[PDB]
């Protein structure tokens, strides 16, 4: 299991500055377990989210469940069991800049990370002690399933 | 006419090897080229050689 | 022809190509201030290698 | 000792460029081994990617004095 | 039209040319496309020696 | 000569005669100027000038 | 503003990437920094009455 981080969201706005662009949606989620709140660019037209909607995110280092972290090109002509049979919506971005929250002016522990799909940003924002292994330029694989 | 005024006025002026500015006699016009010695067109920042911030996270 | 600043005038890397007019990229249209509408630009062909290496490199 | 800048100005590198292409266009002996190149200019610049022009330039400063600098220990670039 | 201004200041050159020029971006930014009727006339000497001699017979 | 009808040739102005001197291009501004134009020998005497 | 201990030794590693500086980048920092700086400098010869008279004349 190379899995960074694995929890259950909740949508609580979908466009919050007005429809913008046709294909994409800025999503603005909370979730259950842990405080995290979730800016999230999707592709609605590939796969509609809507309001009250409630779906599991996953984010890992790799698409493998053995653990192997070789990748030097995706194949998407290759069929194997991987990560991405048990999801419905599976991006790749890079992390690409982890910053401290300024809001407060001493202890705390607030992180943002941000991961561009490309080009679909993500600010992932949550406690520091849920964002163990996230560097800058590591690659991570989204997956994303809605629950019932 | 203008331009060509400036040009005239203004084309003698070269820039020697110990960093001063003379006119065509050999008067000194500037000590060093605009109190720094730098090129304008090297210029990075706002008419500052770099720009610090930008190199760093570069 | 009008030529307001020293970028009026550059040195290109001559190709030949069968029709009738100098064609050159796009890219180059904000220093001549060309626009494509029946205008007109000069050549000039230096004759001497000195000439070739310091329109070349300068 | 010399007080002057260590790189090649952009105004010595067209002047070294242009006498070294214009003796290799009269029949002086190319320093390096050239492969088919034509163009004496091409061979100039081969010549000094790899710092082989047989060229001092003399540096003067205004009030007469010089200094000499060896093409080959002047600090090239872009 | 005197000896100064007609004359010494700006005077005519040969080897140049002059046509109306149109875009093309598949060139290279430092790259102009002459025409064949213009590069037919247009001529550069090349002085003969061990490194071109094969290239000029031909 | 003048123009297109006597094959007459471009004419290096006033003006980029000094976008030449602008880039220090000292010996291609020589070459146009007197090399291309018009070249000729002259012998000067050195004692009565 | 974290409570991140200089040692190197606080649990969750992801704070030591917040302003991450170390001295293979510093050395790197200061000779892009020096190499920025020798070759902006207004190089000797450079015809800088003319780029006055252009700058200002355009
Ligand atoms: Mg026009």
Redesign the pocket.
């Given at each position: 299991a190379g899995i960074l981080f694995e929890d259950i969201f909740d949508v609580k706005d979908i466009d919050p500055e007005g429809k913008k662009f046709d294909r994409v949606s800025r999503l603005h989620c909370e979730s259950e377990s842990f405080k995290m709140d979730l800016i999230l660019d999707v592709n609605i037209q590939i796969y509609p989210v809507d309001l009250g909607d409630k779906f599991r995110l996953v984010i890992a280092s790799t698409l493998y469940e053995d653990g192997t972290l070789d990748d030097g090109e995706y194949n998407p002509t290759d069929d194997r069991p991987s990560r991405a049979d048990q999801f419905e919506y599976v991006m790749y971005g890079k992390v690409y800049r982890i910053e401290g929250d300024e809001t407060s002016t001493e202890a705390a522990t607030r992180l943002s990370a941000y991961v561009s799909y490309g080009g679909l940003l993500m600010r992932l924002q949550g406690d520091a002690n849920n964002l163990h292994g996230f560097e800058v330029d590591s690659r991570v694989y989204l997956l994303m399933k809605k629950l019932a | 006419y203008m331009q060509r005024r400036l040009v005239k006025s203004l084309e003698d002026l070269c820039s020697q090897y110990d960093l001063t500015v003379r006119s065509s006699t050999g008067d000194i016009i500037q000590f060093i080229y605009g109190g720094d010695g730098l090129d304008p067109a090297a210029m990075e920042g706002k008419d500052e050689p770099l720009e610090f911030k930008r190199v760093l996270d570069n | 022809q009008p030529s307001l600043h020293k970028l009026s005038i550059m040195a290109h890397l001559a190709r030949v190509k069968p029709h009738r007019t100098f064609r050159f990229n796009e890219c180059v249209c904000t220093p001549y201030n060309a626009?494509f509408?029946?205008?007109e630009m000069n050549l000039h062909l230096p004759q001497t290698e000195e000439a070739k290496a310091e329109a070349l490199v300068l | 000792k010399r007080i002057t800048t260590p790189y090649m100005t952009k105004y010595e590198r067209a002047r070294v460029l242009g006498t070294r292409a214009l003796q290799i266009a009269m029949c002086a002996p190319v320093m390096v081994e050239l492969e088919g190149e034509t163009d004496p200019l091409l061979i100039a610049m081969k010549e000094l990617k790899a710092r082989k022009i047989p060229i001092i330039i003399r540096r003067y400063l205004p009030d007469g004095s010089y200094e000499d600098w060896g093409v080959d220990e002047l600090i090239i670039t872009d | 039209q005197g000896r100064f201004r007609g004359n010494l200041s700006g005077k005519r050159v040969d080897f140049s040319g002059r046509t109306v020029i149109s875009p093309d971006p598949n060139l290279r930014i430092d790259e102009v496309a002459v025409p064949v009727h213009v590069a037919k006339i247009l001529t550069f000497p090349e002085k003969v020696n061990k490194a071109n001699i094969n290239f000029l017979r031909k | 000569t003048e123009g297109r009808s006597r094959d007459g040739g471009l004419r290096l102005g006033e003006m980029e005669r000094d976008c030449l001197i602008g880039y220090g291009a000292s010996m291609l501004l020589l070459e146009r100027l007197m090399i291309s134009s018009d070249a000729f020998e002259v012998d000067v005497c050195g004692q009565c000038g | 503003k974290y409570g991140i201990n200089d040692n190197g030794t606080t649990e969750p590693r992801v704070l030591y990437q917040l302003d991450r500086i170390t001295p293979t980048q510093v050395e790197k920092f200061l000779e892009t920094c020096r190499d920025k700086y020798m070759r902006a400098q207004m190089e000797p010869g450079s015809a800088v009455g003319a780029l006055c008279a252009q700058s200002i004349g355009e």
């Amino acid at each position: 299991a190379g899995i960074l981080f694995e929890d259950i969201f909740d949508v609580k706005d979908i466009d919050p500055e007005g429809k913008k662009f046709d294909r994409v949606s800025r999503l603005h989620c909370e979730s259950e377990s842990f405080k995290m709140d979730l800016i999230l660019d999707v592709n609605i037209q590939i796969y509609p989210v809507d309001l009250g909607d409630k779906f599991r995110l996953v984010i890992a280092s790799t698409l493998y469940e053995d653990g192997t972290l070789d990748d030097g090109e995706y194949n998407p002509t290759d069929d194997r069991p991987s990560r991405a049979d048990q999801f419905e919506y599976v991006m790749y971005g890079k992390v690409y800049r982890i910053e401290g929250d300024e809001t407060s002016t001493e202890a705390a522990t607030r992180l943002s990370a941000y991961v561009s799909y490309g080009g679909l940003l993500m600010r992932l924002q949550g406690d520091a002690n849920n964002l163990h292994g996230f560097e800058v330029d590591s690659r991570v694989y989204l997956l994303m399933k809605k629950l019932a | 006419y203008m331009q060509r005024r400036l040009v005239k006025s203004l084309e003698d002026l070269c820039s020697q090897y110990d960093l001063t500015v003379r006119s065509s006699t050999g008067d000194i016009i500037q000590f060093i080229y605009g109190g720094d010695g730098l090129d304008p067109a090297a210029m990075e920042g706002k008419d500052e050689p770099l720009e610090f911030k930008r190199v760093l996270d570069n | 022809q009008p030529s307001l600043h020293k970028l009026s005038i550059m040195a290109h890397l001559a190709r030949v190509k069968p029709h009738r007019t100098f064609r050159f990229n796009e890219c180059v249209c904000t220093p001549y201030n060309a626009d494509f509408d029946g205008d007109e630009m000069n050549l000039h062909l230096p004759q001497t290698e000195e000439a070739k290496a310091e329109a070349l490199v300068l | 000792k010399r007080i002057t800048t260590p790189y090649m100005t952009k105004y010595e590198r067209a002047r070294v460029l242009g006498t070294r292409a214009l003796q290799i266009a009269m029949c002086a002996p190319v320093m390096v081994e050239l492969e088919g190149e034509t163009d004496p200019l091409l061979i100039a610049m081969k010549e000094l990617k790899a710092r082989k022009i047989p060229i001092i330039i003399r540096r003067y400063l205004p009030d007469g004095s010089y200094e000499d600098w060896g093409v080959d220990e002047l600090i090239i670039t872009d | 039209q005197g000896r100064f201004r007609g004359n010494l200041s700006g005077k005519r050159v040969d080897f140049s040319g002059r046509t109306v020029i149109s875009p093309d971006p598949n060139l290279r930014i430092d790259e102009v496309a002459v025409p064949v009727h213009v590069a037919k006339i247009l001529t550069f000497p090349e002085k003969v020696n061990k490194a071109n001699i094969n290239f000029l017979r031909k | 000569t003048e123009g297109r009808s006597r094959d007459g040739g471009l004419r290096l102005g006033e003006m980029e005669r000094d976008c030449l001197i602008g880039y220090g291009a000292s010996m291609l501004l020589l070459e146009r100027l007197m090399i291309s134009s018009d070249a000729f020998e002259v012998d000067v005497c050195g004692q009565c000038g | 503003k974290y409570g991140i201990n200089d040692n190197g030794t606080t649990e969750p590693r992801v704070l030591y990437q917040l302003d991450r500086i170390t001295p293979t980048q510093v050395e790197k920092f200061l000779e892009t920094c020096r190499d920025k700086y020798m070759r902006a400098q207004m190089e000797p010869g450079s015809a800088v009455g003319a780029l006055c008279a252009q700058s200002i004349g355009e």
